[PDB]
Automatic annotation (TrEMBL), chain B:
This is NADH-quinone oxidoreductase subunit F. Belongs to the complex I 51 kDa subunit family. The chain holds residues 150 to 297 of 445 of the full protein. NDH-1 shuttles electrons from NADH, via FMN and iron-sulfur (Fe-S) centers, to quinones in the respiratory chain. Composed of 13 different subunits. Subunits NuoCD, E, F, and G constitute the peripheral sector of the complex.
Automatic annotation (TrEMBL), chain C:
One of its GO terms (biological process) is ATP synthesis coupled electron transport. It comes from Escherichia coli. The keyword Translocase applies. InterPro entries: 2Fe-2S_ferredoxin-like_sf, 2Fe-2S_ferredoxin-type, Asp_de-COase-like_dom_sf, MoPterin_dinucl-bd_dom, Mopterin_OxRdtase, Mopterin_OxRdtase_4Fe-4S_dom, NADH_UbQ_OxRdtase_75kDa_su_CS, NADH_UbQ_OxRdtase_ferredoxin. Belongs to the complex I 75 kDa subunit family. This is NADH-quinone oxidoreductase. NDH-1 shuttles electrons from NADH, via FMN and iron-sulfur (Fe-S) centers, to quinones in the respiratory chain. The immediate electron acceptor for the enzyme in this species is believed to be ubiquinone. Couples the redox reaction to proton translocation (for every two electrons transferred, four hydrogen ions are translocated across the cytoplasmic membrane), and thus conserves the redox energy in a proton gradient.
Length: 156, 148, 907
């Protein structure tokens, strides 16, 4: 069972009056609910749909369209490396290999215990600076396959 | 700027409200499109819209709307503050103004710089960006982002 | 308005897109995402045509037909090599991910994707890689779900959400992994979700009711028939195969239900395939039953009827114009009793009077989508006649179209029209005893008893004209709402008023009549629609009889010693105790019916009548449009011993055997002539369809596709010598393919839509003059009456305020789409869908007793002591109780009556 907390419901209701249409707060409501819990559970869809005033179908379409609104159980510290043209050139492949050799998983999976999900991301908009990756909200650039272990040991 | 009078109801004497908001969205590249950004801001799936009607006549919520990039909008303060002619004359190219240009890739000094919009691509690669680094040979290049 | 297509020069409406115009001209352009009812979106990219300029531009540019305005100086070319190659490659891209299952797809020879793949000339696979796959959902007991076959054309979502306002279906995912279904498994809530089976071009959404007993489209045998589950005349085309109704498909009618049906009419047809239907006239010789012949049955019935002191007849409001008449002739005009209660009839003839003698134009079902304001005063339009609810939903979106046309936006660009609207709608003020399904779009809903709704209507009609009767005592908080309704109706240029008979109140109907008269006196071209209970309810009101109460009074008195009940069950129009006590003391009870009702267990003779599927006649809908339905198949075929003649055929032959002593099985046209000769009010049913001997170039119209299969083997198990095809002397159709069904044929009764290259429902583009317009050569219907010069007076009778009585509970009618119809509820498919019986209660009155949310409750209305669960209804007014009308055990006649004692279940 799912029910919206008081803090996140209040934040959604405060976001709903930044726009002319309540619907417009849908992405921000999903991001609030995800911030609190790490992902958007199946009941959060209907809860947000009841708070805003739009159906659960629209909220579920918004949540499954965008790639940073997780609809499946994701660990903590959702690692997102970049694999686009500028990074492909700078060698993000070695960075992905040293990441999935240390986490012992494949891109798209949790590790064992609910920490260090591994995902690829479109581009982090920091191309001139080596292969990049974000862990949760910290952008890490100039990545070297030697410094992946020590950089992962900072997140517990 | 809100606390200092530069934003809010009565901005520096003249009657002009302009409340300013920020919308940090989820990660989809298609929301960068001019008329898919409008859909995403409306809280819907970021699907582009057919033109005409242009966003200028019917845009955000059926109201008029002009979508502008960041650098375009950063260009305007200097135009107004220094003058239209000064901006007209920065350099003798038919694309007036300055531009943020840079070289990415395995160059000796990647980054971006502000250039007079008539600079040869070789003048950015070897003078500013340094050139290919230590044993690498140039093969090709894309002018602009991926998609050119 | 003068385009050039491939050198040829045509004349088109310059106000619609190039796809619409080119399809109206007869040209062939492939298209998946365009629908003539859902506007144009450029999603699929499959209707590409090269566009030039200057008439000498040799290098045009590819552009989508459905999105270009088709203005005057337009030069295009459908056949350009580049356009051909792009259109072909566009289907190749769709075929990259398609599932190799045409043989097992529910719709082969009916699929639009097959049509367009053969049309674009693509019959070679260059793709080599894997296909994307998808898991299905459980959408209900009606329609299936196979997302492997989706081409992402967006028609389902556009229809279901932007058109029908569904709210429980959308699109999910992105980037070639897109998905169209419900957010979670569960049944689809929308009443009009059946139309997804033909809106979707592929076999993603296909109905289960036909998927169980399946047959390819060619094997089907169609005929133009009318939906019989509702007061509207939605034109259907039922298909038969191996002697049983397989499915009910939509039959275009540009004046009534252009492209869409209900679910009650599309899926509630399963009551004709029941294995307990009467198939031979049987006689009850004391306790035993003996099957009779046709001539034997007629001779016996006439011998018993000729010795009777008086014979009365009880026709029903679900027969046909002839069946009732035919009966009327059998018993005398005097002895014919309309099989509806007195109060059920008074407010039916009042609605008929408002439609005929009230000088206000009653719109057709498609003209409802053109009115500014709507006031649904007393009707649950969504549950009784639901296509009117969809029409209202289309009418409330009119303000977005006005805002778009004021900005020079074309009327086919639906995305821009919706974007400009931004949830701005025309005013709509629903009114009912509790919540409705039109509350999401209504501006204000009034939840009150059927007396307070009439008081509101009278208050509106007084605030509009100031000569109508005043209500004298409304309280100022409601006045501020009556004021908004008035300000919104008097300002609208085309208001509509939709009352009905289902509300169970005469005051509601006359209040709506007062509102409409005040508006007409103000100047606006106001329309008025009245929803009746059952198909052909209007025809029974036009013809008229005494009542059911008078018939039962004659029966339980020794005055009438015989009765012929025609297509009536008599238990949902009166008390099942009085009906049985009357029919018990009758030395003759004939029951001409096509179902196995309860009154035919003590019936001395049960003539096996025919259903709508295998019967001919005409039924008049709510606007007085006399439409004719045709026989789909011959019941006798596959079963030689099956005399299932039509009701009017039984009654005419019985009347003949009564006087003549010799049987006379007449023809449909003779019965129609008799009606139009004896009842002048129905003189318009003769023009509803051409009689027999109507031929198209000598040929008569065909009931089966040209390539109908299995002709010399489908009846081989019974006997290898195939019989002669059944003879249709009634109508202009033949029970074979040796007939004519061409788009350009000069007739307006189309059994099914097929054109060479267009197998699917999209073959209806070839049958209409301009796609989305009326059927070429008109639409099959004749309104019986036209608006009068002078209207009725104001009804100077305001009902007093509803004050609840202690110890009595006024029954508030709750109508359900599934289960509130006498015949649809019998379909074994609606048993899964219909709700469980209940009795709604106000919380203030549920807590007044000990009953809580689910506790059974016993109540007495008559002899019967029913016991139903309890649901809490917050919107229902205090001194009322809700009851599911029509649902078995609760007769719709229980609307406005008050049950005298209600208590806990007393377990
Ligand atoms: C697929 C696609 C992605 C785009 N992404 C961006 C973007 O990320 N940032 C941006 O400023 N413009 C982007 N654009 C261009 C915009 O549509 C728009 O022209 C621009 O943001 C504002 O117009 P301006 O360049 O005149 O200021 C994109 C266009 C397309 C077709
Ligand atoms: S949807 Fe049409 S094309 Fe696709 S498998 Fe079914 S019949 Fe064949
Ligand atoms: S499910 Fe059917 S109607 Fe919906 S997008 Fe797919 S093919 Fe089109
Ligand atoms: S609206 Fe009435 S007539 Fe039309 S399909 Fe539905 S039930 Fe049948
Ligand atoms: S491509 Fe990786 S930072 Fe841009
Ligand atoms: S029908 Fe025109 S783009 Fe699909
Ligand atoms: Mg603009
Ligand atoms: Mg048009
Ligand atoms: Mg499955
Ligand atoms: Mg399943
Ligand atoms: Mg889903
Ligand atoms: Mg389909
Ligand atoms: Mg007759
Ligand atoms: Mg017949």
């Amino acid at each position: 069972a799912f029910e919206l907390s008081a803090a996140e419901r209040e934040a959604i209701e405060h976001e709903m009056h930044h726009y002319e249409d309540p619907r417009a707060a849908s992405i921000e409501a999903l991001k609030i609910v995800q911030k609190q819990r790490g992902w958007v559970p199946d009941g959060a869809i209907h809860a947000i749909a009841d708070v805003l005033g739009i159906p659960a179908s629209d909220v579920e379409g918004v949540a499954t369209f965008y790639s940073q609104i997780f609809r499946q159980p994701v660990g903590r510290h959702v690692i997102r490396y970049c694999d686009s043209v500028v990074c492909h050139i700078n060698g993000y492949q070695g960075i992905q290999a040293a990441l999935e050799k240390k986490l012992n998983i494949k891109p798209g999976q949790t590790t064992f215990d609910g920490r260090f999900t591994l995902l690829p991301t479109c581009c982090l908009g920091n191309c001139d600076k080596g292969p990049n990756m974000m862990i949760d909200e910290d952008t890490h650039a100039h990545l070297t396959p030697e410094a992946i272990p020590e950089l992962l040991e900072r997140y517990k | 700027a809100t606390e200092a009078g530069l934003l809010g109801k009565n901005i520096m004497g003249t009657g002009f409200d302009f409340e300013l908001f920020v919308h940090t969205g989820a990660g989809r590249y298609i929301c960068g499109e001019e008329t898919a950004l409008i859909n995403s801001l409306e809280g819907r799936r970021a699907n582009p819209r057919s033109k005409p009607p242009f966003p200028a006549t019917s845009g955000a919520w059926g109201k008029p709307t002009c979508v502008n990039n960041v650098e375009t909008l950063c260009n305007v303060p200097a135009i107004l503050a220094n003058g239209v002619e000064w901006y007209q004359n920065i350099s003798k190219s038919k694309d007036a103004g300055t531009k943020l240009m840079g070289f990415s890739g395995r160059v000796k000094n990647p980054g971006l710089w502000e250039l007079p919009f008539g600079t040869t691509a070789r003048e950015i690669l070897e003078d500013y960006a340094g050139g290919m680094r230590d044993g690498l040979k140039f093969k090709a290049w894309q002018p602009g982002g991926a998609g050119t | 308005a003068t385009i050039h297509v491939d050198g040829k020069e045509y004349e088109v409406n310059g106000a619609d897109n190039l796809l619409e115009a080119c399809l109206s001209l007869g040209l062939d352009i492939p298209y998946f995402c365009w629908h003539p009812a859902l506007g144009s979106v450029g999603a699929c990219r499959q209707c590409a045509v090269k566009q030039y300029q200057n008439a000498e531009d040799t290098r045009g540019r590819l552009v989508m037909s459905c999105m270009t305005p088709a203005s005057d100086g337009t030069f295009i070319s459908i056949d350009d090599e580049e356009a051909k190659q792009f259109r072909e490659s566009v289907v190749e891209w769709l075929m990259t991910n398609h599932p190799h299952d045409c043989p097992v797809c529910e719709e082969g020879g009916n699929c639009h994707l097959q049509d367009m793949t053969v049309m674009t000339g693509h019959s070679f696979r260059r793709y080599r890689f894997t296909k994307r796959t998808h898991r299905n959902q459980d959408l209900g007991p009606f329609i299936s779900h196979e997302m492997n076959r989706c081409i992402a054309c967006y028609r389902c979502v556009r229809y279901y959400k932007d058109y029908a306002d569904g709210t429980d279906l959308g699109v999910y995912g992105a980037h070639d992994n897109v998905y169209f279904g419900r957010p979670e498994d569960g049944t689809l809530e929308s009443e009009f979700s059946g139309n997804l089976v033909e809106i979707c071009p592929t076999g993603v959404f296909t109905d289960k009711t036909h998927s169980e007993r399946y047959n390819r489209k060619w094997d089907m045998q169609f005929a133009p028939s009318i939906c019989q589950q509702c007061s509207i005349g939605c034109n259907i085309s039922p298909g038969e195969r191996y002697g049983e109704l397989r499915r009910i498909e939509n039959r275009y009618n540009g004046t009534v239900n252009h492209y869409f049906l209900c679910d009650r009419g599309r899926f509630g047809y399963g009551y004709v395939n029941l294995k307990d239907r009467p198939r031979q006239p049987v006689q009850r010789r004391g306790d035993d039953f003996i099957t009779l012949n046709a001539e034997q049955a007629m001779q016996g019935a006439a011998d018993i009827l000729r010795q009777s002191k008086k014979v009365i007849g009880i026709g029903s409001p679900r027969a046909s114009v002839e069946s009732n008449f035919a009966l009327r002739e059998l018993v005398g005009e005097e002895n014919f009793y309309t099989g509806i209660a007195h109060g059920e009839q008074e407010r039916l003839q009042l609605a008929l009077k408002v439609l005929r003698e009230g000088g206000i134009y009653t719109p057709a079902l498609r003209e409802i989508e053109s009115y500014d304001a709507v006031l649904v005063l007393g009707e649950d339009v969504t549950q009784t006649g639901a296509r009117v609810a969809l029409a209202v939903r289309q009418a409330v979106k009119g303000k977005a179209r006005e805002m778009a046309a004021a900005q020079k936006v074309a009327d086919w660009q639906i995305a821009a029209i919706l974007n400009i609207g931004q949830r701005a709608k025309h005013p709509l003020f629903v009114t009912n005893v509790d919540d409705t399904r039109l509350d999401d779009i209504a501006a204000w809903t009034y939840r009150a008893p059927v007396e307070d709704q009439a008081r509101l209507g009278f208050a509106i009609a007084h605030a509009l004209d100031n000569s109508a009767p005043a209500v004298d005592g409304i309280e100022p908080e409601l006045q501020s709402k009556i004021d908004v309704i008035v300000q919104a109706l008097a300002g609208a240029k085309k208001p509509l008023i939709i009352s009905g008979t289902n509300a169970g109140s005469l005051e509601v109907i006359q209040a709506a009549a007062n509102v409409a008269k005040a508006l007409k006196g103000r100047g606006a071209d106001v329309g008025i629609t009245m929803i009746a209970r059952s198909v052909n309810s209007m025809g029974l009101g036009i013809m008229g009889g005494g009542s059911l109460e008078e018939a039962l009074t004659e029966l339980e008195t020794g005055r009438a010693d015989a009765v012929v009940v025609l297509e009536n069950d008599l238990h949902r129009h009166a008390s099942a105790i009085r009906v049985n006590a009357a029919l018990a003391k009758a030395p003759l009870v004939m029951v001409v019916d096509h179902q196995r009702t309860a009154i035919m267990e003590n019936a001395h003779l049960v003539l096996s009548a025919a259903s709508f599927a295998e019967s001919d006649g005409t039924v008049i809908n709510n606007e007085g449009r006399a439409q004719r339905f045709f026989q789909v198949y011959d019941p006798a075929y596959y079963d030689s011993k099956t005399v299932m003649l039509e009701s009017w055929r039984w009654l005419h032959s019985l009347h003949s055997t009564l006087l003549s002593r010799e049987v006379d099985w007449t023809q449909l046209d003779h019965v129609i002539d008799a009606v139009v000769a004896k009842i002048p009010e129905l003189a318009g049913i003769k023009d509803a369809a051409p009689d027999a001997t109507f031929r198209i170039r000598g040929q008569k119209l065909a009931r089966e596709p040209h390539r109908y299969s299995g002709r010399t083997a489908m009846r081989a198990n019974i006997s290898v010598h195939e019989p002669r095809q059944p003879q249709d002397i009634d109508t202009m159709f033949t029970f074979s393919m040796e007939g004519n069904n061409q788009p350009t044929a000069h007739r307006s009764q189309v059994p099914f839509a097929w054109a060479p290259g267009w197998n699917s429902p999209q073959a209806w583009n070839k049958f209409q003059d301009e796609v989305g317009g009326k059927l070429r050569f008109g639409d099959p219907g004749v309104r019986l009456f036209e608006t009068s010069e002078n209207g009725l007076d104001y009804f100077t009778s305001v009902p007093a305020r509803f004050q609840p009585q202690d110890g009595k509970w006024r029954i508030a009618p709750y109508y359900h789409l599934f289960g509130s119809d006498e015949l649809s509820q019998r379909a074994p498919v609606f048993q899964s869908r219909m709700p469980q019986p209940y009795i709604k209660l106000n919380p203030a009155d549920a807590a007044k007793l000990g009953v809580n949310a689910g506790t059974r409750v016993s109540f007495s209305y008559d002899g019967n002591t029913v016991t139903l669960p309890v649901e809490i209804a917050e919107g229902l007014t205090a001194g009322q109780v809700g009851l599911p009308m029509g649902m078995s055990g609760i007769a719709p006649v229980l609307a406005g009556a008050h049950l005298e004692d209600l208590k806990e279940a007393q377990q």
